[PDB]
Amino acid sequence: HPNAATSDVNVTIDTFVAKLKRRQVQGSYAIALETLQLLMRFISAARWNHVNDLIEQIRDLGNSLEKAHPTAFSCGNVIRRILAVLRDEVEEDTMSTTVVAEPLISSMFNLLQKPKTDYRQVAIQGIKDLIDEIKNIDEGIQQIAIDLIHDHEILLTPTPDSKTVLKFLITARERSNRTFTVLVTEGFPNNTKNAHEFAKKLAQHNIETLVVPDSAVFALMSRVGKVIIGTKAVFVNGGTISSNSGVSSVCECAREFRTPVFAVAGLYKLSPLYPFDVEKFVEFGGSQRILPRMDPRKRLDTVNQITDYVPPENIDIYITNVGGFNPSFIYRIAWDNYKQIDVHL
Amino acid sequence: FNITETYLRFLEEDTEMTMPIAAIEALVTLLRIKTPETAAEMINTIKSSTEELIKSIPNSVSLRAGCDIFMRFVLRNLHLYGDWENCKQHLIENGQLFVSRAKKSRNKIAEIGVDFIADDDIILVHGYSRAVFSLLNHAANKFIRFRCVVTESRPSKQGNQLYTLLEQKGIPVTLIVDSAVGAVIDKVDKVFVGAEGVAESGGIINLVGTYSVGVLAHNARKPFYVVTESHKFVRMFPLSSDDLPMAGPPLDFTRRTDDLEDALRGPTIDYTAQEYITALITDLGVLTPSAVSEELIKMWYD
Amino acid sequence: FNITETYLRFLEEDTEMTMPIAAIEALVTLLRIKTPETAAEMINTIKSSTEELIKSIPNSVSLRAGCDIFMRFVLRNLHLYGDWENCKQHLIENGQLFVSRAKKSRNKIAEIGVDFIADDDIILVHGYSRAVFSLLNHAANKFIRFRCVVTESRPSKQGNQLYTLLEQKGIPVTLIVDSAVGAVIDKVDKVFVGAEGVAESGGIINLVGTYSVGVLAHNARKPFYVVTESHKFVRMFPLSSDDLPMAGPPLDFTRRTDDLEDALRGPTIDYTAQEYITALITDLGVLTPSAVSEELIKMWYD
């Protein structure tokens, strides 16, 4: 389905498409907020009267949105989240229009046994609840996370880019009973500016700040207590796509030294998609920022990548607003929020 | 009426009628003759026929697993306390519909599990399952670039059988021995496996050298794959590395011989732990670690 | 006079008088005819005959190592500036004395290396060498208890050959396949391996699946042995896991075939790193890691 029907009524579709492609929109948290407001505008303005035609139209809109931008997983997840909230209330509504429906638990196994209202209002409130969930994640993290780190323990941190992780670290430093040393890898080609702002905000709160070059990670791993990841997107198998540069090697460095790896994330950040290949999912950077002069750049074919991937073999905990989970369990948290059909849009 | 004889009739057939799906279809035919109206007369005689089937089994595991799912579906039928007749008609019909579901699942997986094989990747394939080879064939149908390495598995000589079936497709191959399989993990992108069963724990029930493959790959950090159709789940928990249901030898040491007759005896089926599997693929979505157990907990309701 | 023809004459012979020691004896016979006094006329023709021997080699390493030691001894003869006749007579005599030293070394090792096999220990043996089997036989002569597990090595079906040679002694055995070799490392006390060559680094030059054994044993924490006669040392340093001197294939991938002819091709000789060896046994005392390199530095004086 094209945007020929939604042009005069809905204009904000194409402005978000423009914000993605030229990267005017920044950070998964912000991308999610925009798509929420998009779906807010879609229900408030449209006229449908039919339900199944409506849902499949939303599916096509989400399909086009993910094809417009592949790194906008937070875009894809938010739509999928509302899709499932819709689908449950429709299945509840169809049971009343026809007239055990309660075997034991809330399972799966869709391959075994076979099969006017205020539905739109529920769809409205469903968006509102998603916003409030994205608004408050930190409160749900701090009650699980600030229980695992000890005094006189040294924390090494790749990806200082995450707003989520920094605020988790500041709530722990607020506790006068807890003392920790912070090592921060620079992440040269991208994270540099963000890493420097990270080091500034730690000094602002008076926490023992240590800026580390990306070479020196090994030269410290014997002294490191714990490793923390500022992830962008979490997956089915457990693994993460993080906010750029110098993570994968650090995680490899940690596993060889058997140093524990922590991850701070949200359920909206969590994705029901599977990373079959890193080759497709990871976005590559601009080599302009590395080396000047274009006549040597004929012979200097430089390689730089933004997003970095970590395999599930390294990290152990994904502390969310709900709680702490192991990578060998995170799939269930995902299926508790997104349906099996709501994957291939 | 016999059930073991009906399974024995599939000799030159196979391939389409998968080994468990043919045993499940044989279970439905035995059910539909002597009236499924009675639950005392029928279920007890179904249980006796499965027990007779297990007693006739030499080295198969999946037939026991397939029986369980059938049983489960039968019990779930009249869980709504519905008419003792429309529930019965739906039960008899779900025999041909069960075999038809093996085709639909294969249609699903062969489009899902081609994504894992990326642009120009050398694969070392071990074992033979109808799901893994269907991925390999329908990727060649998708016009994707991949190299193949054949493992010399020794049950009824499976490596040679695999090699010939790869020749019929049009994909370049060479024979690699399971002894030298360690010396290959550097020019191999990914290691794939087809399982005889998947454990309650999350481990694997497989052939004459699969654990050995799993460990070496864990050393080389190169990925290890399991691809199957979603019916090979038993409530089995092999506690140790060398403990499995057997009708033959669990490692026998023979006396001094001159004519040379008693020799071969070694563990033909071997287990590997949960940690060694990087990825698992079935029609029930894309899932690996704790997923298998959750499936079994959902089925057994215990 | 030929040297390759003299080596070809040993067909029904072999054993005790080893393959390298027969090549060294062939080197001495070629030397003693055409006057060993001249160092210009002879040494160049000795070098050409070794070069012709290397060109005729299909899959052997130890012949190149044995030539080196001979050369070294020849050069060391007239290191004392002695009579150009008494030093020559001592050089010719050290040919039959070299082969006689293979007897004395085997007499030493089979009394030293029986100590490693303790009271009632199950052994898994791979890669047949004359030194390791001589330990196995002279421990049975010592009346000690030991169980044996046969590995199905695939160069020219060596496992079956090993199994038959164990039957002629009176020690209980059973066939274990190299695929399933991972499933055995729990009931096996110790793993013994006989080498085709020992590296400058401290690694091993061996057969169609030995690295795979080395790694699995490192995972299972069960000891890994190397037992040989002290002549299999080359100034060789395989930098990587898959780099070796070959006359045949370094992993070939063949085109689409229907008649089935081009298949087998896999790495017949494989390297394992220094870390995987727990212990090494030769006649030059009881020593394992850097010991090999010290020996090589001591010989080459470089």
Numbering used by the authors:
A (entry chain C): 10 to 108, 113 to 128, 147 to 376
B (entry chain B), C (entry chain A): 4 to 305
What's the publication's text?
The structure of eIF2B–eIF2(αP) complex was determined to an overall resolution of 4.2 Å at best using the counting mode dataset only (map 1). This structure was obtained by applying a twofold C2 symmetry during EM data processing, resulting in maximum resolution for the most homogeneous parts of the model but an averaged position for the eIF2 molecules, which showed a high degree of conformational heterogeneity at the periphery of the complex. As judged by the relatively high local resolution, which reflects low local flexibility and mobility, the strongest contact consists of eIF2α domain D1 inserted between the N-terminal helix bundle domains of α and δ regulatory subunits of eIF2B. The domain is inserted between the N-terminal helix bundle domains of δ and α subunits of one set of eIF2B subunits rather than binding the central cleft of eIF2B as proposed in a previous model. The most extensive interaction surface area (844 Å2) is between the eIF2α-D1 and eIF2Bα subunits, which would explain why eIF2B mutants lacking an α subunit are not sensitive to eIF2α phosphorylation, as the major part of the binding surface with eIF2α-D1 would be lost. The density in eIF2α-D1 leading to and including the phosphorylated Ser51 is visible, however, the arginine-rich loop following this serine seems to be only partially ordered. At this resolution, we cannot establish with complete confidence the interaction partners of Ser51-P because the densities for the side chains around the residue are not absolutely clear. However, the closest residues to the phosphate on Ser51 appear to be eIF2Bα H82 and Y304 and R75 slightly further away. Furthermore, in this position the phosphate may affect the conformation of the short α-helix 58–63 after the Arg-rich loop that in turn makes contacts with the eIF2Bδ NTD in our structure. eIF2Bδ residues E377 and L381 are likely to be involved in this interaction as mutations E377K and L381Q were shown to overcome the effect of Ser51 phosphorylation, suggesting that described mutations would disrupt or weaken this interaction. eIF2α phosphorylation is known to increase its binding affinity to eIF2B38, and our structure suggests that this is due to a combination of direct contact of Ser51-P with residues in eIF2Bα (H82 and/or Y304 and/or a long electrostatic interaction with R75) as well as tighter induced interaction of the 58–63 α-helix with eIF2Bδ.
For multiple rounds of initiation to occur, the GDP on eIF2 has to be exchanged for GTP. This reaction is catalysed by a guanine nucleotide exchange factor (GEF) eIF2B. Here we have determined a cryoEM structure of eIF2B in complex with the GDP-bound form of eIF2 phosphorylated at Ser51 on the α subunit, which sheds light on the molecular interactions between the two molecules and provides a basis for understanding the regulation of translation by eIF2α phosphorylation. The structure consists of two eIF2 molecules bound to opposite sides of the eIF2B hetero-decamer.
